[PDB]
Amino acid sequence: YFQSMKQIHVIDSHTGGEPTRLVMKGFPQLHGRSMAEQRDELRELHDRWRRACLLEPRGNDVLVGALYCPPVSADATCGVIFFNNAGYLNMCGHGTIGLVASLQHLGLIAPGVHKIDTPVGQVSATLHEDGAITVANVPSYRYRQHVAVNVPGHGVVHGDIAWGGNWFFLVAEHGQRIELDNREVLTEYTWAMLKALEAQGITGENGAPIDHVELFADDPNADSRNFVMCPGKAYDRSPCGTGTSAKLACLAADGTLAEGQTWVQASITGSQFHGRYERDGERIRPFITGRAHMTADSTLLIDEQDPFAWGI
Amino acid sequence: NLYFQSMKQIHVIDSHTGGEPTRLVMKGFPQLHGRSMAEQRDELRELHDRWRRACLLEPRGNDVLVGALYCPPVSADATCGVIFFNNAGYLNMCGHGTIGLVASLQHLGLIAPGVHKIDTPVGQVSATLHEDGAITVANVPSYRYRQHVAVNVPGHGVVHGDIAWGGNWFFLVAEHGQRIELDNREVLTEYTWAMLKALEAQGITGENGAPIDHVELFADDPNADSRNFVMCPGKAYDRSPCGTGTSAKLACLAADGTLAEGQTWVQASITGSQFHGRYERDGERIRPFITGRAHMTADSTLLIDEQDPFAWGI
């Protein structure tokens, strides 16, 4: 009977609490030569597979899926296509940490530098001997500093606007408590803040929407703790790789963090990433280190008689 | 493969009942010495709560999930015992989870169609596995307490609802002003949550002052007798038609004579899943019977990494 249903072999993991569903077998054969072609193929010809994995009931609003692919470039370990319950992603830092940890435990890679092919080019990740993984983030920078926004029901706040692979508004939050049991308040506040930025025409470079907000506060045992609001009104359980890269860019620009020095960023759940940077013109090269842990080895089952087989 | 067994493992079968998911634990929890399900449930809560938490807290679980521990039977009559739980604690009964259990046991080769008795921490629940795979559960006795009660909900003026017990207290509204559609769930959530606050503020309760903690809205449907939206504690909506809520609905239909004894009511949910319901009379109350289906969604080995600060849940 189980043998009768369509099967998808996945390895679920989390990176600082933010989960990754790595698909190792069961999606359709993709004939695209490039990772972008394969991604387009999935989206256009085979989207039910993403949806079965990411929509309810099998998925949720925080999960990212990752399709393992054979490498396309000569020196890459593999290819990957990331996706969530709304569509396809291109890069995904926490998912890449999940991927590399998973591949290690499956016996497919050893410690060292690994190149991973994505739809938008290669990502370099270093698997350390102790199992931590460092992602070379895209070049990051601060676009504007100390920008005012009025947030309905809360008042005026100032933040930096910075690119770390996504656009962020970064706020030194003194008013609200950055603790996990205050998450519903922080969720409503930061979501309102995102909507207020849009309404007030506050954007990244060349009008790009700011679709992430991150709040920072002191922490007794890290350099900082954050609360990160993402698309879909979901907070990041992790310190957020691109968001921490954007923070490093701001710290670098202000001189708060020296080149080569380590910044320890705690998340709302108490997980941590380490980061450091090198300067490169008006930008920085950020390096974000974190860990992933396995949480399930699972055969997803698709009952083709279920109206919700491919997700709700 | 040696690494995947540096890790503690829990074998689960995940399924959903009309969209509402059940995680059935088939192996990996500690041995329980309780002679009864109530004692075993107490054992879990008191001596072994990390297992529930690994399964139901993030990252492995979520707010919608219910877990069910499979247990060897303890009443002589029984196919098995079960203990239900969610990310907050232990439940007693769980109709949708029982449908999940029975469907899962069938697919695992443990049972065949027929009547199956299942031991629970509050005694038995009887479930019929039909030849076509559907499963009928007997809900607790249900009844309407009050009829056509007014509540003022700011932004809506007065709404009327029935107050009925189906295992929980519900306020049941024939909703003509709100669109009962999944893409309108945000608006429906704010409305029903406001309605619960207004009932409380205006002293509208169940029997003996019991708080009403569920609201269900009902509308016409072109392929069912009705479609609903069901608001539950924690500001959560039921993906399914809701077993206890549909039982409360049956009690109101029976009281008004809208549904005849033995006749079937087809209740669609916000997600477009459906249950069937019928009742028999029990003095001034009813015995409701809820029929639905569960579908398998995963056969999974949960893995616990000892080096993981979140191994046992966030």
Looking at beta carbons, which residues of chain B come within 8 Å of A58?
14, 297-298
Cis before A239? omega within 30: no
* Helix-, strand-, coil-residue percentages of chain A, each rounded to 5: 25, 40, 35
CB–CB of B159/B191 below 8 Å? no
DSSP assignment of B146-169 equals EEEEEEEETTTEEEEEEEEESSSE
Nearest to B204 by CA among B171, B226, B237, B172: B171
> Which residue of B295, B303, B305 is in closest CB contact with A308?
B295
Looking at beta carbons, which residues of chain B come within 8 Å of A19?
58-59
Question: Which residue does chain B place closest to A108, by CA atoms?
Answer: B1
Question: Which residue does chain A place closest to B307, by CA atoms?
Answer: A293
DSSP assignment of A161-178 equals EEESSSEEEEEE-SSS--
What b/e readout covers B115-139, taking b as 16+ CB neighbours within 10 angstroms?
A: ebebbbbeebbebbbeeeebbbbbb
* Helix-, strand-, coil-residue percentages of chain B, each rounded to 5: 25, 40, 35
> Which residue of B20, B59, B62 is in closest CB contact with A295?
B59
Q: What is the dihedral of CA B22, B28, B30, B33, to 10 degrees?
A: 70
Is there a contact between B295 and A312 if contact means CB atoms under 8 Å apart?
A: no
CB–CB of A230/A89 below 8 Å? no
Catalytic residue (choose from A69, A92, A230, A250): A92
Give residues with Cβ within 8 angstroms of A220, minimum separation 6. Answer: none
**Residue ranges of B for the binding site?**
95-96, 214, 238, 243-244
Sign of the torsion angle spanned by Cα atoms A74, A76, A78, A79: negative
Q: Which domains does chain A have, with CATH numbers?
A: 1-137+291-312 (3.10.310.10), 138-290 (3.10.310.10)
Give me the phi and psi of B274, to 5 degrees please. Answer: -135, 145
Is there a contact between B273 and A300 if contact means CB atoms under 8 Å apart?
A: no
Is there a contact between B295 and A305 if contact means CB atoms under 8 Å apart?
A: yes
User: B75 touching A, CB under 8 A?
Assistant: no
Give residues with Cβ within 8 angstroms of A15, minimum separation 6. Answer: A94, A95, A97, A98, A101, A238, A290, A291, A292
Give me the phi and psi of B20, to 5 degrees please. Answer: -100, 115
d(CA A291, CA A239): 12
Is there a contact between A271 and B239 if contact means CB atoms under 8 Å apart?
A: no
Neighbours of B112 (CB within 10 A): 10
Does A78 participate in catalysis according to the annotation? no
Is there a contact between A308 and B62 if contact means CB atoms under 8 Å apart?
A: no
Residues present in chain A in total: 312
Is there a contact between B4 and A105 if contact means CB atoms under 8 Å apart?
A: yes
d(CA A243, CA A127): 21
In chain A, positions 159-198, which contact chain B (CB-CB < 8 Å)? Answer: 180
Classified as helix, coil or strand, B272 is: coil
**Amino acid at position A305, single letter:** Q
Question: Which pair of structure tokens corresponds to residue B95?
Answer: 């109709």
Neighbours of B20 (CB within 10 A): 29
Nearest to B109 by CA among A1, A300, A5: A1
Looking at beta carbons, which residues of chain A come within 8 Å of B14?
57-58
Is there a contact between B298 and A293 if contact means CB atoms under 8 Å apart?
A: no
In chain A, positions 10-39, which contact chain B (CB-CB < 8 Å)? Answer: 12, 14, 17-19
Looking at beta carbons, which residues of chain B come within 8 Å of A56?
19, 21, 64, 239
Looking at beta carbons, which residues of chain B come within 8 Å of A107?
3
Nearest to B300 by CA among B9, B69, B68: B9
d(CA B155, CA B56): 37
